[PDB]
Enzyme design. Structure first.
Site, PDB file in Angstrom:
ATOM      1  N   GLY A   1     -45.803   9.138 -39.374  1.00 46.50           N
ATOM      2  CA  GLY A   1     -46.460   8.390 -38.305  1.00 46.50           C
ATOM      3  C   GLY A   1     -47.746   7.466 -38.520  1.00 46.50           C
ATOM      4  O   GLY A   1     -47.446   6.871 -40.135  1.00 46.50           O
TER       5      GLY A   1
ATOM      6  N   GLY B   1     -49.844  11.092 -37.783  1.00 42.18           N
ATOM      7  CA  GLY B   1     -49.640  12.139 -38.820  1.00 42.18           C
ATOM      8  C   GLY B   1     -48.571  12.698 -39.231  1.00 42.18           C
ATOM      9  O   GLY B   1     -47.836  11.941 -39.237  1.00 42.18           O
TER      10      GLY B   1
ATOM     11  N   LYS C   1     -46.832  18.854 -35.327  1.00 39.31           N
ATOM     12  CA  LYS C   1     -47.578  17.590 -35.441  1.00 39.31           C
ATOM     13  C   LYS C   1     -49.017  17.805 -36.469  1.00 39.31           C
ATOM     14  O   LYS C   1     -50.193  17.926 -35.292  1.00 39.31           O
ATOM     15  CB  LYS C   1     -47.285  16.692 -34.176  1.00 39.31           C
ATOM     16  CG  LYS C   1     -45.892  16.485 -34.107  1.00 39.31           C
ATOM     17  CD  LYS C   1     -45.784  15.072 -33.538  1.00 39.31           C
ATOM     18  CE  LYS C   1     -44.968  14.711 -31.587  1.00 39.31           C
ATOM     19  NZ  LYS C   1     -46.679  14.854 -31.150  1.00 39.31           N
TER      20      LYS C   1
ATOM     21  N   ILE D   1     -40.090  17.375 -41.658  1.00 37.77           N
ATOM     22  CA  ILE D   1     -39.055  16.536 -41.261  1.00 37.77           C
ATOM     23  C   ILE D   1     -39.940  14.902 -40.238  1.00 37.77           C
ATOM     24  O   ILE D   1     -40.039  15.051 -39.296  1.00 37.77           O
ATOM     25  CB  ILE D   1     -38.731  17.194 -40.106  1.00 37.77           C
ATOM     26  CG1 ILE D   1     -39.495  18.114 -39.256  1.00 37.77           C
ATOM     27  CG2 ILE D   1     -37.244  18.063 -40.431  1.00 37.77           C
ATOM     28  CD1 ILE D   1     -39.285  18.531 -37.882  1.00 37.77           C
TER      29      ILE D   1
ATOM     30  N   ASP E   1     -42.666   4.114 -22.804  1.00 39.67           N
ATOM     31  CA  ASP E   1     -42.144   3.755 -24.673  1.00 39.67           C
ATOM     32  C   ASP E   1     -41.114   4.830 -24.571  1.00 39.67           C
ATOM     33  O   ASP E   1     -40.851   5.187 -25.431  1.00 39.67           O
ATOM     34  CB  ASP E   1     -43.660   4.078 -25.607  1.00 39.67           C
ATOM     35  CG  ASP E   1     -43.166   3.816 -26.895  1.00 39.67           C
ATOM     36  OD1 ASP E   1     -42.489   2.505 -26.766  1.00 39.67           O
ATOM     37  OD2 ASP E   1     -43.867   4.833 -27.708  1.00 39.67           O
TER      38      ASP E   1
HETATM   39  N1  LIG Z   1     -40.354  19.127 -31.022  1.00 37.92           N
HETATM   40  C1  LIG Z   1     -40.007  18.468 -32.642  1.00 37.92           C
HETATM   41  N2  LIG Z   1     -38.795  19.006 -32.964  1.00 37.92           N
HETATM   42  C2  LIG Z   1     -38.200  18.376 -34.001  1.00 37.92           C
HETATM   43  N3  LIG Z   1     -38.341  17.398 -34.524  1.00 37.92           N
HETATM   44  C3  LIG Z   1     -39.649  16.247 -34.182  1.00 37.92           C
HETATM   45  C4  LIG Z   1     -39.820  17.073 -32.997  1.00 37.92           C
HETATM   46  N4  LIG Z   1     -41.101  15.939 -32.794  1.00 37.92           N
HETATM   47  C5  LIG Z   1     -40.750  15.095 -33.977  1.00 37.92           C
HETATM   48  N5  LIG Z   1     -40.184  14.976 -33.919  1.00 37.92           N
HETATM   49  C6  LIG Z   1     -39.943  14.259 -35.664  1.00 37.92           C
HETATM   50  O1  LIG Z   1     -40.285  14.060 -36.259  1.00 37.92           O
HETATM   51  C7  LIG Z   1     -40.432  12.948 -37.029  1.00 37.92           C
HETATM   52  C8  LIG Z   1     -42.245  11.745 -36.982  1.00 37.92           C
HETATM   53  O2  LIG Z   1     -41.468  11.200 -35.300  1.00 37.92           O
HETATM   54  P1  LIG Z   1     -42.723  11.156 -34.199  1.00 37.92           P
HETATM   55  O3  LIG Z   1     -43.311  12.414 -34.345  1.00 37.92           O
HETATM   56  O4  LIG Z   1     -41.562  11.647 -33.091  1.00 37.92           O
HETATM   57  O5  LIG Z   1     -42.963  10.414 -34.234  1.00 37.92           O
HETATM   58  P2  LIG Z   1     -45.039  10.141 -34.847  1.00 37.92           P
HETATM   59  O6  LIG Z   1     -44.760   8.292 -34.861  1.00 37.92           O
HETATM   60  O7  LIG Z   1     -45.133  10.678 -35.175  1.00 37.92           O
HETATM   61  N6  LIG Z   1     -45.489   9.996 -33.113  1.00 37.92           N
HETATM   62  P3  LIG Z   1     -44.789  10.267 -31.429  1.00 37.92           P
HETATM   63  O8  LIG Z   1     -43.144   9.732 -30.963  1.00 37.92           O
HETATM   64  O9  LIG Z   1     -45.586  10.103 -30.157  1.00 37.92           O
HETATM   65  O10 LIG Z   1     -43.932  11.804 -31.525  1.00 37.92           O
HETATM   66  C9  LIG Z   1     -39.067  11.919 -36.501  1.00 37.92           C
HETATM   67  O11 LIG Z   1     -38.349  12.538 -37.468  1.00 37.92           O
HETATM   68  C10 LIG Z   1     -39.060  13.019 -35.606  1.00 37.92           C
HETATM   69  O12 LIG Z   1     -37.714  13.049 -34.889  1.00 37.92           O
END
Ligand SMILES: Nc1ncnc2c1ncn2[C@@H]1O[C@H](COP(=O)(O)OP(=O)(O)NP(=O)(O)O)[C@@H](O)[C@H]1O
Length: 346
Positions: A24, A27, A44, A21, A139
């Site tokens: 980034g 990771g 993550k 899902i 942010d």
């Molecule tokens: N707790 C969570 N539950 C479900 N999906 C998630 C969650 N955290 C992140 N995602 C999803 O995973 C993907 C990666 O995005 P995300 O991790 O938010 O950004 P990133 O650039 O990896 N770092 P960050 O914004 O700090 O979290 C996106 O499609 C998010 O919406």
């Protein structure tokens, strides 16, 4: 070692049935079955130990997320890392599975006025706690607001968060800045390091405007074209608001611009709740000192169906000093992360 889009995603036996899902700059993120709580969860994978920058934002986010306990801020449920610093290459953050985010929602879904209300309520309820901890998120944008299938909203991504430091906010004109362009307050481009609470309220106001129209209200393609979009709608800053900008480069830039009248919110959003447009106005005030603070937003008539200050908790343990991280080697930073993650080890 379990593989995912076959890299390593070694959440060993406890967490199974992985699925991509997104990814980034640190990771990759996966859904996964928690064989102990019988519930899917988000994980993550973070691999930052190569670059001092990645270690800082990771150390920052883990410290804050462990200190914070609030319904509208994402929690850490678990952290998976090697038992030793030498073996630790990756860290895995376990979090409540959220089915979507406001970014993904706004591209495809029309929000009712009830949804916009409730989403904004939860954003400011989370931000009230954050600001009470003397922390600035810095942010806030739709992708950083997660939602589950029952519309519970949780704020995430504290990588760019700082301790409030309004005494040391002033800076020159066109000072560089990292956080999402479209949600950056005008003072960021003018004379602000982004070290006072009012930069978060600006971002929230941009998010409100986005929820009303499914489009980002200030889509600037670059740094100065951001300022052009804001004044395109707020109109020319008043003498009073210029009086507050003492830095001559910022001031003379604003003076160089043609006169523009304020474009009133009702003509941008003719279908919106008038109380919503009133709150939008106070959130998107050019002057940071005149901009509504988080508690006043929560008390706005627009949010009166939800407003309950007894049910909008503040932090027990606020950060009372800046996190002195800025030039620590990525080796001390790995040590600090190792140490911050110890409580999740058996
Ligand atoms: N707790 C969570 N539950 C479900 N999906 C998630 C969650 N955290 C992140 N995602 C999803 O995973 C993907 C990666 O995005 P995300 O991790 O938010 O950004 P990133 O650039 O990896 N770092 P960050 O914004 O700090 O979290 C996106 O499609 C998010 O919406």
């Amino acid at each position: 070692a379990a593989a995912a889009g076959p890299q390593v995603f070694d959440v060993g036996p406890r967490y199974t049935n992985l699925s991509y899902i997104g990814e980034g700059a640190y990771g990759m993120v996966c859904s996964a079955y928690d064989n102990l709580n019988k519930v899917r969860v988000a994980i993550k994978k973070i691999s930052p130990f190569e670059h001092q920058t990645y270690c800082q934002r990771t150390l920052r986010e883990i410290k804050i997320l462990l200190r914070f306990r609030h319904e509208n801020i994402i929690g850490i449920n678990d952290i998976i890392r090697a038992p030793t610093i030498e073996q630790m290459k990756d860290v895995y953050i376990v979090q409540d599975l959220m089915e979507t985010d406001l970014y993904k929602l706004l591209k495809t879904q029309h929000l009712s006025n009830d949804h916009i209300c409730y989403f904004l309520y939860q954003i400011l309820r989370g931000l009230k706690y954050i600001h009470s901890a003397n922390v600035l998120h810095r942010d806030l944008k739709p992708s950083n607001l997660l939602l589950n299938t029952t519309c519970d909203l949780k704020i995430c991504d504290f990588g760019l968060a700082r301790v409030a430091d309004p005494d040391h906010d002033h800076t020159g004109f066109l000072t560089e800045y990292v956080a999402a362009r479209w949600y950056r307050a005008p003072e960021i481009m003018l004379n602000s390091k982004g070290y006072t609470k009012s930069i978060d309220i600006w971002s929230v106001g941009c998010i409100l405007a986005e929820m009303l129209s499914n489009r980002p209200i200030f889509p600037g393609k670059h740094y100065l074209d951001q300022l052009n979009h804001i004044l395109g709608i707020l109109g020319s800053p008043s003498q009073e608001d210029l009086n507050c900008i003492i830095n001559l480069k910022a001031r003379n830039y604003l003076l160089s611009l043609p006169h523009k009248n304020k474009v009133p919110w009702n003509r941008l959003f003719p279908n919106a709740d008038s109380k919503a447009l009133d709150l939008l106005d106070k959130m998107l005030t050019f002057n940071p000192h005149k901009r509504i603070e988080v508690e006043q937003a929560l008390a706005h008539p627009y949010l009166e169906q939800y407003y309950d200050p007894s049910d909008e908790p503040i932090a027990e343990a606020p950060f009372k000093f800046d996190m002195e991280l800025d030039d620590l080697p990525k080796e001390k930073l790995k040590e600090l992360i190792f140490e911050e993650t110890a409580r999740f080890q058996p």
